[PDB]
Design a protein around this nucleic acid. Structure first.
Ligand SMILES: COc1ccc2ncc(F)c(C[C@H](O)[C@]34CC[C@](NCc5ccc6c(n5)NC(=O)CO6)(CC3)CO4)c2n1
Ligand SMILES: [Mn+2]
Ligand SMILES: [Mn+2]
Lengths: 670, 672
DNA sequence: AGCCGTAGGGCCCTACGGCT
DNA sequence: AGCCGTAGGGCCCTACGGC
């Protein structure tokens, strides 16, 4: 992998460490091949702080660096046997590049500490504004970053060693709480000391993963990748009435315009939203192989096609009506939504799961009818308890159905935001004839791989870890649904074999609820009431802003129509005014003066076509106006009374509940 | 990789062979898990007719098939050991799916012949209009292709065994001539199944598709479908040299979606090549980021790169909007695409072409644009111009990598027959380096030669004592210096002797084997330099003739509209009252038409007229446009009435392109 | 040989948290 | 131990023809 230099005098030789071959190519073209070597790594390197020594010494990327430096590791480390006097870390000018830098400084600190001590370790500084060095032209990477005449390099300096020893243990170690504490105390919503560098770069990454990757927003229940996918579909008119659009086009559009990450991350997020076993209310409607419950992946994006589901329209409803705030995209060239209008409670409906830095999230799916009735009960009573809300919201409702054992785990999860929810498969004991029996599984727990589960039972039987099982078959079909058959030995108690399967296999899986969502852009552990309160505050805002916008637009349009009506009342005069004018400026000024018209009104008259002078067209102008006057009155009523605004929110949620609300799938047992 | 069925009774068991995991998923979801098994392959299978046994037996896909069937192969073939009584070939409903089918049948016929004799081999029939079984929903697949209650399976039948051996030999064999002769004899340009008929039809659909729609360039624009689709793709989305760079993935996805139903790398890599100044004599793509090197390094992932048209590409696309070329329906009928680009410069000869098809291959070298244009101007003035007179203009190929060409001999043979071997030599010098010692400095290498790989080949000869006198070898190439390969010479060793050996033993000297095959009326044809130029000129004459014809239609329509607005402004008051007293737009139309002697288009142009057109400046503006239009109409009719005038217009336009884009010759033709 | 360039097709290593 | 889901990064087999 190493693209070495001509020279063999380490004192003048430099080694540049890059993320992969895309950045490597630009680097090999722009460099000085006499004194500058290039080692392209393969993305994220191993965390030596969290890893076992054997794993470290056998890792291909760790080995490639050891071999290239020629200094050996730990105690056998000889700074004399070094092949470069500058080890230059040149990761990409993004948050994951900062993370790879922290992962590298950690390996150098725990294994090659004298390399830092000798001042041999540097950090390159490529221009921000690129996603990778592979986006840069060789001449651009050279002058800015690699030429010793123009480059700005940071030399890594280890000042206090005990402070550094505590830093690497805090940020890179296996104890989460210390990292969480560090993020909480520090989050904000030339030589360089290693401790400062590790703290600033790790906080850059942690923060970014927390607010812009792994955690959902409380208002719409979406993570940046899902929001950008849905918006991408909205922008391209990939609505349910239109035909399916190729996945490659959606992925490429979303990536180019909103998501500066790999295709794999975008396509896989899109695929999951299109799976009925993953989403309680699927957001994407996919044509083709979108994977299975057996862990089978979707077909490559060239084969599949997609569009929004009917319910996705409710997530994007009124986005163009000044309901939500837009922000600049990653490069300034595009505008993206900060949140979606979310006309149905998506956070609780589809749930969420995401591994962040210092924290994680695990919100289960819920039944739409129960959520809406929950939100409606809350609208009528701000003081409602979790117990009362539970009269509406019984508990989670998995797309895979099954059983939940007891309401105590649910109660605790809705009150504290944390709890263990015991899930069970739908299994029954039935006869197969000849005095023999079988166990028939028709519903498996949520997020459990059906094939992998069957293989675990197979494994237990083969290893004689369970008694009574004579056969095991997956009789699932498009036609009969999920059907897993476990044949029992004649005279053996099948209820005992079933109880054993529940203790030994994923046939019984628990769901550890950990309700962390972004509230006002900060991660917060929330309870059931809080999740709903935030959803309702959001809906009141969306509806109010839509009404304020529709009113501004209706007034602007009534204004224009008042001008067209004046023109229809004085057509000969209007014509004479335009005809007697040499320019469009003169006509516009003369019209404004003669008929007390605004600039907007006179431009509208000047833009009016001759076909608009016929009987039908004259009528259309009068009818649009009379309709709009009534519409302005209707809107002005909504903004004059807060109880009328709140009742519209309730009426709109009621319509959604009546159209999209479905039956409970998951049975809650006592 | 096999997803077997639960039943262990071969009689009721079926095995489906699919192209990969994308098709497998859809297949696995729709099937009857009790009776149907799925084996997903990994694309194109090995051709057993062209392979030796060590290779056949080491192949993962071949191995996976033998194991799943359990019958064994050749002499040890046992039909009783068959785990399935139905081996169903289920490749995608595309040309490549037909090729994979011929590849699978060749293996079954050569290694598992009794399995065909027994009637255990069948061919599935999925619907077309899908990109792969991975595009179909599971329920759709079961109904149309897998359900025994509704499917239509062809059972492979071996009729005449002597006839089959020859069909497998001719089509899949190592001798290219018999295969080429089969395509020449059978090509047409512009239930049980007989193995021979299946092989002949599927292989011919594949062969014809690679020839007319993949590997060979069109004589008129010099482009292959992928490149023409990329360039049309950029044109549609306005990714011109004046606009900013657009994301590589957005281009790739758009082109794949709308025009090219093929894999992503194929699109991106064709776009990358068109952007490389060492690949293209006149690059067609302007790229931002890592687009590869002469060292065989590939481009950065498409997520990193940005692209747009070069100024020269605007000349390839110039007049596409003006009815010059025939548009055709795309692969799925939802879009329209050009069959050929107007190509205002001779692209086939300028950038060359390199392609491996079925039964043939093409190898066309790049040329200097100033020379080519001068050659076309010469042929326009003299239809009977000889190849010898053309060579006064077109000296020989002119590589983007410069270098040297040894003699006019190979060039002359290639330009007269379309076939010749042209010796390409590196630009190499012998210079002193101090201490009474010398070195060989290489600054230009031959075309399509990987620099790093050539250096590795020289290093190899030195390590393996096959060359004497070399002491060191370095690549000193930089953005500052340009290509610079340094070979150190041992003190007192003859440096020219070392150099002459390096030419004889390494890519330092390479041969360009000219084989000028291009599509002519959609048919592969071996053309010489004159025929290439003749076909280019005729295409240009038609492009200009059609553009002229289009503008004349456009102007005459415009003049007719203006005649109506002229009448409307001369009677504005009666025009307004006519419209004011009309209940509907249709009534106004009919009224303006009868009263003022207007046509449907004229009456509609008046009804669409905005009130601002009634200002004083407008009636004068209209009479100005109408009068400059009459002059314009006259000019166009003059061009279309005299062919000499039309030909002079072609000459003029090519002379401009020559003065705007013509560059100096890079490659030196040394008389050796 | 093994390369040239458009085509078919897919796999595996890393981080990060909380649960088992 | 290892699985869940957004992220960093890349490789290798096959057909085809002409030297
Ligand atoms: C797969 O099975 C294997 C097996 C082994 C492999 N070993 C190494 C290796 F690097 C890869 C991956 C391969 O290198 C790629 C990487 C990204 C990939 N999509 C890019 C993209 C990004 C953005 C896009 C589109 N495509 N397509 C579009 O149409 C527009 O948007 C193109 C190449 C998909 O696979 C392997 N893949
Ligand atoms: Mn990166
Ligand atoms: Mn295919």
């Amino acid at each position: 992998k190493l693209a070495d230099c001509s020279s063999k005098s380490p004192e003048e030789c430099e080694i540049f460490l890059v993320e992969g071959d895309s950045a490597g190519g630009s680097t090999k073209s722009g460099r000085d091949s006499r004194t500058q070597a290039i080692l392209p790594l393969r993305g994220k390197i191993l965390n030596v702080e969290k890893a076992r020594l054997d794993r470290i010494l056998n890792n291909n990327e760790i080995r490639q660096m050891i071999t290239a430096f020629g200094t050996g590791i730990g105690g056998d480390f000889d700074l004399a046997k070094a092949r470069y006097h500058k080890i230059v870390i040149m990761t990409d000018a993004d948050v994951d590049g900062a993370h790879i830098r922290t992962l590298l400084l950690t390996f150098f600190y725990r294994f090659m500490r004298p390399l830092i001590e000798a001042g041999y370790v540097y950090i390159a500084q490529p221009p921000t504004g690129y996603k990778g060095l592979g986006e840069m032209n060789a001449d651009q990477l050279w002058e800015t970053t690699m030429n010793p005449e123009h480059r700005a390099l940071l030399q890594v300096k280890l000042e206090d060693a005990i402070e550094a020893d505590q830093t690497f243990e805090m940020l890179m170690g296996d104890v989460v709480e210390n990292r969480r504490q560090f993020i909480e105390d520090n989050a904000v919503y030339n030589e360089r000391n290693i401790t400062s560098e590790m703290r600033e770069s790790f906080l850059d990454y942690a923060m970014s993963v927390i607010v812009a990757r792994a955690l959902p927003d409380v208002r719409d229940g979406l993570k940046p990748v899902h929001r950008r996918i849905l918006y991408g579909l909205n922008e391209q008119g990939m609505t349910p009435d239109k035909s399916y659009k190729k996945s490659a086009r959606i992925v490429g559009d979303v990536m180019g315009k909103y998501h500066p990450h790999g295709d794999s991350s975008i396509y896989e997020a899109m695929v999951r939203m299109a799976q009925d076993f993953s989403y309680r209310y699927p957001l994407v409607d996919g044509q083709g192989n979108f994977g299975s419950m057996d862990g089978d992946g979707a077909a490559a994006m060239r084969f599949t096609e997609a569009r929004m589901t009917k319910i996705t329209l409710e997530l994007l409803r009124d986005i163009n009506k000044d309901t939500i705030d837009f922000i600049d995209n990653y490069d300034g060239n595009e505008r993206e939504p900060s949140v979606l209008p979310a006309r149905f409670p998506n956070l609780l409906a589809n749930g969420a799961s995401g591994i962040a830095v210092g924290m994680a999230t695990n919100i289960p799916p819920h039944n739409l009818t129960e959520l809406i009735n929950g939100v409606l009960s809350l609208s009528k009573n701000p003081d409602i308890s979790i117990a009362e809300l539970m009269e509406d919201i019984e508990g989670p409702d998995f797309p895979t159905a099954g059983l939940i054992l007891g309401k105590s785990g649910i109660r605790r999860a809705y009150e504290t935001g944390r709890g263990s929810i015991q899930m069970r498969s739908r299994a029954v004991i039935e006869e197969r004839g000849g005095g023999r029996q079988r166990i028939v599984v028709t519903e498996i727990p949520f997020q459990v791989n059906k094939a992998r589960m069957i293989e675990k039972i197979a494994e237990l039987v083969r290893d004689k870890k369970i008694d009574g099982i004579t056969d095991l078959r997956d009789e699932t079909s498009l036609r009969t649904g999920v059907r897993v058959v476990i044949d029992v030995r004649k005279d053996a108690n099948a209820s005992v074999i079933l109880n054993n399967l529940y203790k030994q296999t994923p046939l019984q899986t628990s769901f550890g609820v950990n309700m962390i969502a972004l509230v006002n852009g900060r991660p917060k552990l929330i309870n059931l009431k809080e999740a709903l309160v935030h959803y309702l505050e959001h809906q009141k805002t969306v509806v109010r802003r839509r009404t304020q916008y529709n009113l501004r637009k209706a007034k602007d349009r009534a204004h224009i129509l008042e001008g067209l009506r004046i023109a229809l009342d004085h057509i000969d005069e209007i014509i004479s005014t335009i005809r007697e004018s040499d320019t469009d400026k003169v006509a516009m000024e003369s019209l404004q003066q003669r008929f007390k018209l605004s600039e907007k009104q006179a431009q509208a008259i000047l833009d009016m076509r001759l076909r608009r002078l016929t009987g039908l067209e004259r009528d259309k102008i009068e009818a649009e106006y009379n309709e709009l006057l009534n519409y302005i009155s209707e809107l002005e009523t909504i903004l004059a009374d807060e109880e009328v605004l709140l009742q519209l929110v309730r009426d709109e949620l009621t319509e959604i509940r009546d159209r999209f609300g479905d039956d409970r799938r998951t049975e809650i047992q006592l």
